[PDB]
Structures are given as structure tokens and as C-alpha cells.
Amino acid sequence: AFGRATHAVVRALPESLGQHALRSAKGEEVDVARAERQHQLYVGVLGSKLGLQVVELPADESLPDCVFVEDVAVVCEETALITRPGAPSRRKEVDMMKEALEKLQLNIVEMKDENATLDGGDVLFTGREFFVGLSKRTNQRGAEILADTFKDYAVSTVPVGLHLKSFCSMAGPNLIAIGSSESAQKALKIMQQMSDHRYDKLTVPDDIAANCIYLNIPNKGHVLLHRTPEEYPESAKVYEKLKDHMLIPVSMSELEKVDGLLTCCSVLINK
Numbered sequence: 001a002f003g004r005a006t007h008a009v010v011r012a013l014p015e016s017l018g019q020h021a022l023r024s025a026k027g028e029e030v031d032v033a034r035a036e037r038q039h040q041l042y043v044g045v046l047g048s049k050l051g052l053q054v055v056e057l058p059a060d061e062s063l064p065d066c067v068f069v070e071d072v073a074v075v076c077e078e079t080a081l082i083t084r085p086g087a088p089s090r091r092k093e094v095d096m097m098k099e100a101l102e103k104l105q106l107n108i109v110e111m112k113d114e115n116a117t118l119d120g121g122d123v124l125f126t127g128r129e130f131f132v133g134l135s136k137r138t139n140q141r142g143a144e145i146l147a148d149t150f151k152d153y154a155v156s157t158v159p160v161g162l163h164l165k166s167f168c169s170m171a172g173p174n175l176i177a178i179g180s181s182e183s184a185q186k187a188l189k190i191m192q193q194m195s196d197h198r199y200d201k202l203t204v205p206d207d208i209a210a211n212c213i214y215l216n217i218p219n220k221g222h223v224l225l226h227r228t229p230e231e232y233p234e235s236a237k238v239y240e241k242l243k244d245h246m247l248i249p250v251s252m253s254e255l256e257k258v259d260g261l262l263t264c265c266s267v268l269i270n271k
């Protein structure tokens with residue numbers, strides 16, 4: 001039953017995020033207080049509103065990017081792959097996630113291979129298979145350690161934004177939310193070519209807005225957190241057509257300046 005979760009692991013953002021977090025382009029100053037309000041609302045949604053049991057990890061001032069828990073672990077059924085992030089300075093974020101995932105009683109596999117890198121952001125799990133983006137953060141070797149870790153599922157690579165999921169994510173069972181850029185469309189074509197199964201697409205005009213969180217929640221049904229009309233009015237109009245989904249608009253305008261999107265800030269676990 002695709003999209004079932006019971007627990008979410010999140011991590012508070014440090015003050016140092018505003019000045020020190022990595023970012024692909026020069027942009028507006030981060031309002032850290034607003035980032036913090038935004039992250040608290042996102043956590044309220046997962047935990048309070050949807051009834052996930054949320055594990056809130058503490059902020060660490062020396063890891064400015066520690067809010068982006070998605071990059072440090074990939075979880076599938078009862079197994080957590082603790083990644084080796086492509087940004088060397090992010091590698092230490094791994095320790096606290098490992099301990100949290102142990103306490104959730106997952107089987108833990110650690111990427112230790114000094115020649116392997118992988119960000120969880122480069123990883124798209126469709127319910128049937130994995131697509132893994134080969135980017136500046138995720139290499140071949142990292143993708144192979146992922147394949148060797150989740151033996152029950154097919155894994156395929158796609159050349160890559162920062163990550164594969166900078167422009168796609170699952171919006172439902174068999175439904176790939178996808179951006180409209182040359183990049184997003186070239187990647188999707190490769191993904192579609194490499195798999196026998198036929199996925200449906202939800203094409204949005206804003207690549208960044210194709211990053212959403214889908215959940216299947218008992219007594220709720222299909223649930224989708226997506227970017228707001230205020231941030232991306234033309235993409236929100238697309239999500240609005242999902243009449244069988246509970247649609248929840250979530251802002252991430254602040255974290256967006258350091259390249260974070262909706263999926264970057266939780267690890268969703270079914271237990």
C-alpha cells in the first residue's frame with residue numbers, strides 16, 4: 001500500500017543555517033526566524049495534523065545543513081540505508097540519524113565505502129522500484145550500494161538541479177509529479193524508457209513545485225503536501241485537480257534559498 005508511514009524523522013535548523021548552509025546560487029538573505037516558523041509548520045503537519053510519530057532531532061550549529069535529513073538516510077520497509085553525503089562537510093549529520101533509526105528498530109546498513117557518495121535527495125522510490133540520480137552528490141558506486149542494500153527492488157540510474165528530486169517526486173500510487181524544463185523532461189524520458197511499468201505523470205510548470213510529499217493515511221486516504229499558491233500559483237492549480245487527495249499547502253520559501261524542498265526535511269518510516 002504505497003505511501004503508508006507511521007513515523008517521521010526530522011531535525012531542527014540551526015541559527016548557522018542562514019549564513020552557512022550550502023546553496024547552488026546567490027540569492028536573497030535567509031530569514032532564519034521565518035525558516036524556523038516554516039519548518040515548525042511542516043513538522044505540525046506531519047506530526048500533529050496527520051498523526052505521524054515524529055522524532056525531532058536537535059539542531060547542531062556546526063552542521064548548518066542538518067535540517068535536510070532526507071540526504072542522510074533512505075528507508076525502505078524495515079531497512080535504513082545510512083548514506084555517505086556527497087558534500088563532505090555534511091558527513092557528520094549521519095551519526096544522529098543512525099542512532100534515531102536504531103531506536104526505531106530498523107536494520108541499519110551504513111555506506112562507509114570511501115569512494116561511494118549518495119544523497120537521499122537523488123533517490124526516488126516509486127513503490128515498485130528505485131530511480132537514482134547520478135549528480136555531483138551521488139555517484140555510480142553509491143547507487144550500487146543502494147541496489148545491494150534493497151535487494152527486493154529494481155534500481156536504475158538517471159543522469160542529473162542538485163538532485164533528481166529537485167524536479168520530481170511521487171504525488172500518488174503510480175503517479176510521478178514532474179517539472180516541465182528540458183532537464184526534468186529528459187530525466188523522466190530516461191526513467192520511463194528503463195522501466196516496463198507504466199507510470200502516470202503529473203506535470204507542473206515549476207520544477208521546484210514538482211517536489212511534494214504523498215502519504216496514504218488510514219482514515220484519511222490520499223494526502224499531498226504541496227507548495228502554496230503564493231509561491232507557485234501555476235503549479236498549485238495543477239495539484240488542485242487532485243480531487244481524491246487531501247491537499248495541504250506548505251511554504252518552504254526560506255529553505256528554498258539553500259535548495260531545500262518539501263521532501264528534504266523528513267525521512268518517512270512505516271513501522
Ligand SMILES: */O=C(\[N])[N][C][C][C][C]([N])C([O])=O
Nearest residue numbers: 022068070121258259260264
Ligand atoms: O532536497 C534535498 N533532499 N536536499 C537539499 C539539501 C540542500 C543543502 N543546502 C545542500 O546539501 O547543499
